[model samples]
Target chain A: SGFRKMAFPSGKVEGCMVQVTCGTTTLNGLWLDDVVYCPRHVICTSEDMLNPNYEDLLIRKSNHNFLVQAGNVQLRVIGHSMQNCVLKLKVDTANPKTPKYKFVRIQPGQTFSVLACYNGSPSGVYQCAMRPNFTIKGSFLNGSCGSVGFNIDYDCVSFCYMHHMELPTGVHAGTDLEGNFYGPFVDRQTAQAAGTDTTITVNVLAWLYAAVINGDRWFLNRFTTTLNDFNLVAMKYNYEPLTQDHVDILGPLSAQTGIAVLDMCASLKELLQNGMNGRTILGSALLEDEFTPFDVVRQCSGVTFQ
Target chain B: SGFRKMAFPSGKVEGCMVQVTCGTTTLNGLWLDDVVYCPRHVICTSEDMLNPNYEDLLIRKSNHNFLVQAGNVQLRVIGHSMQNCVLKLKVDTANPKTPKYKFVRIQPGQTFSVLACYNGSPSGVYQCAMRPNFTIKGSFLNGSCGSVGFNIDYDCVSFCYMHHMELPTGVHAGTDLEGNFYGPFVDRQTAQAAGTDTTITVNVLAWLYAAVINGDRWFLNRFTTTLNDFNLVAMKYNYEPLTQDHVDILGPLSAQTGIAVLDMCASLKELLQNGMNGRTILGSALLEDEFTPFDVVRQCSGVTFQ
Candidate 1:
């Protein structure tokens, strides 16, 4: 282990003559000694320092400018076997590609000095490096440096859609037949026949037309008869596929077009297969973008068809 | 909507009136008026209570040890229409099979009531029958008259397996060399020392005799060495084949022992061909139950064979 001393230029240095120390025991062992006076130049040499030790020191000037040149740094061999050791010195910079200076082959028991021209570079933050192969084995003014020492926290952000589709109808495609396709058809009819008739009658007419044109004969029979038989029969059978025409027409025109089409088939199939007891269809298209009309049908019916 | 009061035993008594209600607005329209009473005998009845606006009422008598029953309930219509509606009633017995009364009907608004003495049998819990053709609808309740009403909320309970096996290796067998095997080696030492030993030295007479008699130089130089080379070449080129030995070991073992023997060579070949990095044979083996032994050879060399 050894040490070195570094010095600052004379007139530009308004602070006390300070000594920087580095240790062989715990701290990285690279130090500078005796500072040399470069009379004409602004930068001082190691010969200028009167006395130095193996510890880092800071010298501050009156102009708020400071110099932290290397001082009294002792290079010690911490391990018995120093196979492939290399020392590197790096000054932190705004740009990472080009470092300020790099010194290598800093031998096991040697000391070196660094000098600073007080007016040369701005007095901001800087860092040093010492690598002994893939593993870092030396210290900086603060600590040892590695290849991956950059701050990675808070550099990136992610976005998500939080609004869930309502169950069985709205966004989630609930199991209500009227809320899904039938409701959409009624809405379209009401929009088309706004001043002609009340919305309720328009809705009923829309349903009636759907029942007739979409081949939902059972449902159409329910509309024409006053018997519970037809109504029960219509309710028992799944009418979504039977009413695909109604869905194709009404679904594409809804405000939430994609979701409405999905829900129309999903709710109808679920109502037919699982019924309205308590079985629920899971997942909402709002949260899962991959949910298609076919996916909803498959989930509700637990069947996949070409 | 309308309500009709019918008396048990064909006469009106203070508490013998059983009122039936119908139409879409009955629940909202009648309120407490929809009730069944038992002044001298318990009676039961069924009306269409699956409508959205149907409710039932039950009352207990102070002087008489009897209960009246009423309420709207959900019913699941399974078969075709009203023809499936059947009702069975027991006056005061715990079981409905031996019930004192039963009835069935298909009319739009048919209702029935029965009267039975409650001297020995219990008075509150009575069972009635509806055809099995329709599933049980909403939650049903026994009104005070020991009668149950149908609603639309009732559903069925189904059961399924909680855990299922996924991505079975069996599914990937013949398409790749998943089930394969190789050798019945002579011994561990013979297996390891199959290749040439370059050095030669003088041997004692007894040692020469032993070597000559027990040594299998031909088997060592040709058979075992070829096997070793084959293994190395397979790993080097990432080749996997369904060998005869593999079929002998895995196929018969699978048939007789009914257990799967994973093909580690095929799995390793697949993984490497996919260009997976930052992984080692040892690390991959730690993740799965099986692995190729050639991984040891490759890792020891610190490079892929090719």
Candidate 2:
């Protein structure tokens, strides 16, 4: 157990406790930080929900089967219908064929893309193969199984801090807290005017996570500039697409390594630039609070990401 | 004369009027805008000094021969030895052989680079040829004369908003208001760890000019992140070097088009990204107050140019 400094958008810096438990098939130990009291959790087992003492455990019942514990260590699967497990996969920017997947238990409130893929080759092309519902144990439940194990990708997208009111096309990233949609299209179009052909996708949520969660209050109200700033970073670095390496580093150090460390924004500039140098890396911080999602971040902030 | 909104770092947005006059030139017309009451001026003649009416005209006599005029336009040069004229030239990033220079009469307090070059061929090389004092009307005085006329470059450089304490090498820009030296080296080193080889040069003064001069105070503290941002932009766009075109557009639109219009930061992101896409363009706004140079800007702000 370790206590780390967690900054809130409300101008408060609190020392929060981070407790972790090692597990391969279930939501292990709790890392409480993003919100107050209730920390975000990973893959949760039906046995976890049956624990009456786990009142604060926030779970999204919309797409999955909730389990009720029977006698002893037995569990009864309460099926309302097979819950859709949205797997957001990450490919190594250095090597695309190597995708990294993490199983985060569905939270109380959040939307995700319901799709998985065939993991047969490393040919550098993303072919979406919509499969059946995923198991809580981080694998495809049934149907024609793939050649190997399944990879679960998150339902993550960027929220831009744009200037104008009109949102561009093909940007699935939703609106900001102020009900305005922002994207790299307008920024790309602007760069195109200056003869820059590359398209830059800036993940606002990553920056927000870096600054806000890291206790840099100065980040608020300065959001719009971040997009502009990140655009320059991605363009200048010739940033590559996200890869497994990017994902491994983004997740909690405790999760990736056996050691737990407090995350900070000291390397945020590098991290952001690293992602912009290629396919944008959906930072681990942005993946925090699976229950909250992008909407929550947008709600917490009304400013634009420059 | 036209009125435009000027934003102060103090959160005050004031309406200011701008006036212009055509000249060969002396500080043509009054642009009264940068500060309250007294606006930043252009090149002023020694004859203008004799007039008690031009009280607000800021002048720098450090390295110039102050002229005293008599009988209509008869002028006497006050020998302060020969005041060194520091020429900062802007070569087109598209073609470095095409350097554009602006002659702004030195003002109250500002530091500048005191070197001029011999312009001959368009062979894309900058060879610094130390020259003598400059004339009040734009050309250099008698010396080993070159082929055509002389170009008057400004003494301008970038002041970065960096994160750490130790500064890198080759960065001539000075300390910030908080007495911190920021540079692209640290940023470059950081990017190098991630496999980015491009060396990005971000002009902090440009962002400051766009935000501060354009009345966007939100840009003040957010400076440190700009270097990171511009790095991505320049890398992605394969930014060239500063070009005559960049300099031409940076000067006041009135100065360029014979048409006066207010400038704003709506396109600042584009402008910053444009410069980062190649050699950084020392923006027109950064070249505004000749009297109050980078030092004054450092004094006015303690924030980084992220």
Candidate 3:
């Protein structure tokens, strides 16, 4: 079959082959490439069980650093993933009966009161859909994922290239790989200075400014940040900067706002005054070189009171 | 209070003051700087809602080019994402119900046979915990995201001077940010022929590679190549070459082998008569250049004797 080339990931791939397959059941090594074999299913000293590189075979995996939030949909079921399936059945974020927020809020040491009516793609006969209302009270003090990842790639004498790698896990997704992310709620609590003996133990909600990693692999937190809750998913800057007063007011600033996105601004107000337009509002209002609050005052003095 | 600095994305964030907030949320502005002061909750086109350039407001988002597989636990809950919360739950993987395979086989147009006992961290009497078991069948034919990614940084005003930015809406998560990955599965399916003119397209199982984008603006596929289904998380040079004949025979070769990892060979067999080592095997097990399959014949020396 003719092969197609995928966009290269910032590097030289030289030659590469990509394959995909699926079945209602599991795959046999004889059928899939995630195996050690030959035409005869042979096992060399480096075969299955004991290989010197067995050590290299020991890899730890992780989850996508996907942070869950209020609007994101959450699914729940019983058993080995999808013996039954239905997303809209339990909660339709776009059509929630009780609205304010869409999905469950994941906060460490958090408790929630979820309410909903029956809905879903359903599981026929066995279970009938019913109104869904529930609560989850828990905290992931340490965070999830202790992936036991591993590696090796071979196909007898024709090809045998073994490279160690990961499951590229995360709650932080793509960014976690770079060893950068302000997630996994180290300490999640409302900000308050009255509680601790010391004015600050460095757990102050630093927002984006709170933490940093040094070349030495050491992380220093400027604020007294706390762990994220069990269910908060994004922190894109939370991307906005904040007032120091508010920072210390809120406990853990490590909470994710969300991923940096396409800076888009639509359905904007038809007209903005004070020289404020979309480019100015959506964009910067082309500030004057010596911009100051006084500039607005001086401009207002010359304008007619609408 | 003072503030620290997060690695700015990239842009000219002149006079920008990024802010971060969550919970009984939403913000207001003070004429002094970041807002239009007012009632406990105030909204202004130029106020918090309508602030100046929002130089302090832009944010970036990333992606879920998240790859799923058969046997891998797929979680279905009422609301948010908890995919990772359980990696350490039912299976530690290396310690699994199955030996090598870790995920469920993903298929196109496939349906499930869910079996659940009804379980969730319920909110007291309103909800109950039942053994959770369910099945689902879905299609991601069109792909997961239609994101229009972007980038910026304030440090250099051209790229490094950055603030976080994100999708203005909640439905979209990590697809809007550039330099981040909403990729990996950009080219989804593998190239295969004689495989049914087209491997039966079904919602049966569309693990990681069933999605792609056709936008004229942005084109991506993040990882040079992911280890893929039936494998752990990630790597590099895993983007290598493969023998097509051997490929067509290996049904789901898409199963990842791993990144061009550390290139380690701790305890190799060292010597495999017909072919074993690289220098010996790759170097010659069939090498010596002009040397061919017949070289292997000479190396074998007139069949085995009794």
List each candidate's DockQ score: 0.01, 0.01, 0.01
lDDT to native, each model: 0.19, 0.22, 0.16
lDDT by residue for model 1 (B144-246), tens: 1212221111121011000000111100000001111011111011222112111110011111112122221111111122334334544454233334454
Q: What DockQ results for candidate 1?
A: 0.01
| Interface RMSD after interface superposition, model 2 | 28.1
User: Candidate 2 residues B150-180, lDDT tens each?
Assistant: 1122211121111111112211121221222
* Model 3 TM-score on a 0 to 1 scale: 0.15
Question: How many clashes does each candidate structure show, in the order listed?
Answer: 62, 70, 169
User: Could you tell which candidate, 1 or 2, scores higher by TM-score?
Assistant: 2
For model 1, how many clashes?
A: 62
The C-alpha RMSD of each candidate to the native structure, in angstroms, is: 41.8, 28.9, 31.7
The residue-by-residue lDDT of candidate 3 on B187-278, one tens digit each, is 11222111111111111011111111001111111223222321121111121122233233223312322212111010010111122222
TM-score of each model, paired residue for residue: 0.12, 0.16, 0.15
Which CAPRI quality tier does the interface of model 2 achieve? incorrect
Off by more than 4 A, model 2: A1-244, A247-262, A265-306, B1-96, B105-306
| CA deviation > 4 Å runs, candidate 3 | A1-246, A249-306, B1-210, B213-306
